Structures are given as structure tokens and as C-alpha cells.
Amino acid sequence: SWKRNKFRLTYVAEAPDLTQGLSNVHKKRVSAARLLSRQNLQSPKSSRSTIFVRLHTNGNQELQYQPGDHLGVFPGNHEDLVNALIERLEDAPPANHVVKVEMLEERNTALGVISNWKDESRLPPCTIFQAFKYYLDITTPPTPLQLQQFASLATNEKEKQRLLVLSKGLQEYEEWKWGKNPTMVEVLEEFPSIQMPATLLLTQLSLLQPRYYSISSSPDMYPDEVHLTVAIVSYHTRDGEGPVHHGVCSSWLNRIQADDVVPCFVRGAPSFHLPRNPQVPCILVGPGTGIAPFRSFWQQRQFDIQHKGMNPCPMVLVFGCRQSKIDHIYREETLQAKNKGVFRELYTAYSREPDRPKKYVQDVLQEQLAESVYRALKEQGGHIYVCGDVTMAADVLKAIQRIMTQQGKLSEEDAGVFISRLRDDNRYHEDIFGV
Ligand SMILES: Cc1cc2nc3c(=O)[nH]c(=O)nc-3n(C[C@H](O)[C@H](O)[C@H](O)COP(=O)(O)OP(=O)(O)OC[C@H]3O[C@@H](n4cnc5c(N)ncnc54)[C@H](O)[C@@H]3O)c2cc1C
Numbered sequence: 001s002w003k004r005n006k007f008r009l010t011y012v013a014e015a016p017d018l019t020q021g022l023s024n025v026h027k028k029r030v031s032a033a034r035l036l037s038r039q040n041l042q043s044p045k046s047s048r049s050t051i052f053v054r055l056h057t058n059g060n061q062e063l064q065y066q067p068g069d070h071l072g073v074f075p076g077n078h079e080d081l082v083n084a085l086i087e088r089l090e091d092a093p094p095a096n097h098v099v100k101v102e103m104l105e106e107r108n109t110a111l112g113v114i115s116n117w118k119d120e121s122r123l124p125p126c127t128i129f130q131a132f133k134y135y136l137d138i139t140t141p142p143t144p145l146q147l148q149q150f151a152s153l154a155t156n157e158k159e160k161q162r163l164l165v166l167s168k169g170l171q172e173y174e175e176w177k178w179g180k181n182p183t184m185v186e187v188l189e190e191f192p193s194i195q196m197p198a199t200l201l202l203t204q205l206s207l208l209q210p211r212y213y214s215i216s217s218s219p220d221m222y223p224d225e226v227h228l229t230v231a232i233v234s235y236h237t238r239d240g241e242g243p244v245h246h247g248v249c250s251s252w253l254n255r256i257q258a259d260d261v262v263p264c265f266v267r268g269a270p271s272f273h274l275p276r277n278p279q280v281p282c283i284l285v286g287p288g289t290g291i292a293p294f295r296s297f298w299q300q301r302q303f304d305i306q307h308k309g310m311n312p313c314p315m316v317l318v319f320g321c322r323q324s325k326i327d328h329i330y331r332e333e334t335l336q337a338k339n340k341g342v343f344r345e346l347y348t349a350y351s352r353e354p355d356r357p358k359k360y361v362q363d364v365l366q367e368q369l370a371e372s373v374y375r376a377l378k379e380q381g382g383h384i385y386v387c388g389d390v391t392m393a394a395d396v397l398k399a400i401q402r403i404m405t406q407q408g409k410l411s412e413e414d415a416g417v418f419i420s421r422l423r424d425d426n427r428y429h430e431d432i433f434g435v
């Protein structure tokens with residue numbers, strides 16, 4: 001918690017570089033990758049965007065990965081936002097000097113009570129600008145409790161009262177939060193009478209979390225590179241008259257220039273790797289950006305075939321998107337992979353195709369691949385991988401359970417048990433893109 005005269009900023013001469021600071025803060029080895037290129041994957045006439053990102057690992061062995069793994073990425077908040085926030089600070093040193101945070105530690109029933117300054121040691125030594133851009137979350141709306149604290153900092157009665165109403169965290173708060181999705185700087189601007197101490201924000205804001213992305217490349221096909229498939233998150237606030245808010249990491253990845261440092265790390269996904277046995281059938285289900293890990297899969301299989309002399313069992317891809325002319329990302333690539341024997345068949349379920357009835361990936365599974373799915377999973381030691389949206393994944397599970405009841409001639413209960421065992425045996429895989 002925070003209180004006046006509890007924290008102070010102190011100038012210091014030494015400071016680690018970004019990747020070291022992040023490593024120290026998050027207690028894990030963060031590495032420095034480089035942006036090689038970025039390309040838009042959807043049609044320019046699309047209302048949305050998905051970008052293809054190519055990163056170079058600088059030959060750093062700590063960034064070794066296998067198809068199916070994830071890459072945690074640390075983005076930077078937008079500078080205009082960082083600058084605007086610093087401008088609303090009450091006692092902020094120029095934001096270009098390296099400082100550390102010290103906290104007045106007081107002790108107990110020690111009869112007189114003894115205070116002692118010492119390093120808080122949350123953030124590493126850095127400038128205020130660097131702290132707000134690379135280490136802290138300045139975008140997540142403040143909690144009712146934070147607004148309560150903000151109320152005691154407002155010098156305008158009317159504003160204090162409003163803040164106090166919101167601090168109740170009920171109807172008024174929900175309306176405010178859900179309608180405005182206010183960033184920290186936005187709150188200070190709505191209530192300009194708030195006297196915001198730099199130390200409060202520097203110690204109370206949460207740490208900026210890394211964002212995970214399913215690696216979209218095979219390490220053999222692209223040595224020293226890591227590819228990502230990123231949906232661009234952008235949204236209108238206040239029903240339309242409010243400003244447009246952009247996802248922090250996706251917008252950052254959409255802004256960086258070639259050579260810019262991208263702090264990241266690999267997080268292995270032991271339960272989302274291709275099978276050790278190349279001869280069993282695999283069915284890949286990944287609509288939209290959910291196709292991401294499967295790009296690493298088809299590149300690896302293509303490489304294994306053409307360079308390792310392997311003859312793996314051809315896989316099946318079940319993709320889905322809105323329209324053939326808008327968001328059918330990686331279309332030509334999957335086509336070429338099929339031509340080289342990686343895939344036996346490709347399927348695409350279009351949901352908003354002009355003059356075409358809506359189709360979801362689960363529809364393809366049930367209407368065109370029911371017997372195939374059943375034979376692969378039950379009789380051929382096969383695997384099924386599902387990647388993407390959480391609701392889609394849940395719906396696909398249901399479709400597979402239905403296939404098991406019909407094709408397998410099982411009761412609801414036993415179909416569920418079978419699927420549960422598939423998960424346990426690591427033959428049913430899920431890569432869900434959670435919030
Ligand atoms: C294991 C794992 C793998 C993943 N792989 C991928 C991948 O390969 N490709 C990919 O694109 N994503 C992937 N995701 C998502 C990714 O990690 C990020 O969560 C996503 O890119 C958004 O990050 P951001 O920083 O851009 O957004 P943030 O700034 O964190 O904001 C995201 C938040 O924006 C808010 N938001 C979005 N639209 C609206 C709206 N209309 N109204 C109000 N609020 C809104 C929500 O609160 C939302 O959760 C994965 C997630 C996990 C857990």
C-alpha cells in the first residue's frame with residue numbers, strides 16, 4: 001500500500017540494459033531478439049488486421065524452440081501515452097534520469113519505532129520514462145479501491161465526490177469502466193484536480209506482463225529466426241465517441257522498426273508438440289490466428305520430408321475464417337505444403353463468405369470428417385490439435401465428443417471418458433489463446 005512520506009526517488013549512476021532489467025524483475029532469462037520484418041496478412045479492405053512478424057534470435061541459444069512452443073514478448077507502452085502520463089505527475093524528477101525507489105521501513109513494538117530507508121527493489125534502476133514504458137501497466141483501469149485512494153488526492157470537491165461514488169465499485173463504477181475502459185492517464189485527465197505523486201504510480205501500478213504468442217516457424221526451415229502471427233487489437237471506447245484503444249503488445253509489434261530490440265523468452269509447450277511417431281495421423285484445427293502453431297508444424301514436416309528423408313503420415317488441416325478475399329491468411333503456403341505431401345487434405349470453413357452459408361471448423365469435422373476423426377483417434381493412434389479462441393475450442397471438443405458417440409457408438413458418458421483419456425495420453429492437444 002502507499003502513503004505520503006513512505007517512498008522516495010533517489011538518483012543512481014548504474015543501471016542494467018532492458019533485457020537484464022526485465023530478467024531481474026521477472027525472475028527469468030529474457031533475451032534480446034531483433035525485428036527482421038512485418039507484413040499484413042489480411043486484405044487492405046479488411047476492417048481488421050493480422051500481422052506476420054519475423055524476429056532474428058541473434059544466434060542466442062536460450063531462444064531455442066520446437067514447433068508448438070510459445071514466445072513470451074515484453075512490449076513497450078506507446079510513448080505519447082507515457083509522456084502524457086508523466087505530465088500529470090505532481091513531484092516527478094525530469095523523466096530522463098536514472099532513479100531507484102526507496103521505502104521507509106518502520107519497525108514494530110520496538111518501543112519508539114525505528115524507521116530505515118532501503119531499496120524497494122521492485123523495479124530496477126531506470127528513468128521514470130523507462131519505468132512507465134517498459135515495466136509498468138498504465139493501461140488497465142484502476143480498481144474501485146484505487147479510485148478511493150485517488151479521491152483523497154483530488155483538490156476539487158465535485159471530482160472527489162465523483163471518484164468516491166466510483167470507489168463503491170457498483171453500478172456507477174461498472175458503467176464507467178465498461179463504457180470507457182479508461183487508461184491511467186485518461187483517469188487523471190477526467191479528474192485534473194488529482195495530485196498524483198510519482199512514487200504512488202511507480203509503486204502501485206502492476207508490472208507490465210509479457211504476452212505469449214504461438215511460434216509460427218520451424219527452427220530448421222528458418223535458422224536463427226522466430227515467426228509470429230499476431231491479431232491486431234484495436235477498439236472504440238464510449239460506444240463510438242471515445243478514443244480508440246489499442247492492445248499494448250499487438251500495437252507495439254505493429255509499430256517497431258527493423259533492428260529494434262524485442263525482449264523475449266521461449267516457453268516450452270510439451271503437450272503441443274508433433275508426435276514422436278511420424279506415422280500416426282494428425283488433425284490440426286485452428287481457425288483465424290489459431291493457425292499460428294500449425295505453420296510451425298507444416299514447415300517442420302516439409303523440412304523433415306525434403307531434408308531428413310522422412311515419410312510422415314500426411315496431416316489434415318481444418319482452418320476457418322470470415323472470407324476467402326479478406327482473412328484467409330497463409331492460403332498459398334498451406335497449398336504448397338499440401339502439394340509437397342505435408343497435408344493429405346485442406347479444409348476451410350468460411351463464416352461470412354458472400355452467398356455462402358456460415359461454416360465453422362466443427363461443421364467440417366462433423367459433416368466431412370466424422371469417420372476420419374473417429375478412425376484416427378480411436379483406431380490409428382492418431383492425434384488432434386485445437387488452437388485458438390477459448391469458446392471455439394470448447395465447441396470443437398463437443399463436436400469431437402459427438403463424433404465419438406455416433407461413430408464409436410458410445411453413450412454420452414463414455415464418449416466423454418474417451419476424450420478425457422486422449423487428453424491424459426497427450427493425443428488430444430489444446431493451445432488456447434486466453435485473456
Ligand atoms: C498460451 C497463449 C498463446 C497465444 N498466442 C497468440 C498468437 O499466436 N497470436 C495472437 O494474436 N494472439 C495470441 N494470444 C494472445 C496474446 O498473448 C495477447 O493476449 C493479445 O495479443 C493481446 O495483447 P495486447 O497486449 O495487444 O492487448 P492488451 O493490451 O493486453 O489488451 C487485451 C485486452 O484488450 C481488451 N479489449 C480488446 N478488444 C476490446 C473491446 N472491443 N472493448 C473493451 N476491451 C477490449 C480486453 O480486456 C483484452 O483482453 C495467446 C495467449 C496465450 C495465453
Ligand SMILES: NC(=O)c1ccc[n+]([C@@H]2O[C@H](COP(=O)([O-])OP(=O)(O)OC[C@H]3O[C@@H](n4cnc5c(N)ncnc54)[C@H](OP(=O)(O)O)[C@@H]3O)[C@@H](O)[C@H]2O)c1
Pocket residue numbers: 231232233287288289290320321322349350351352360361362388389390391392393395396
Ligand atoms: N473469433 C473468436 O473466436 C473470437 C472471440 C472474441 C474475440 N476475438 C478477437 O478477435 C481477434 C482474432 O481472433 P481469432 O483469429 O482467434 O478469431 P477470429 O478471426 O475472429 O475468428 C476466426 C473464425 O472463427 C469463427 N468462430 C467464432 N466463434 C466460433 C466458435 N464458437 N466455434 C467455431 N468457430 C467460431 C469466426 O466466425 P464469425 O465471427 O463470423 O462468427 C471466424 O470464421 C483477436 O484479437 C481476439 O482476441 C476472437
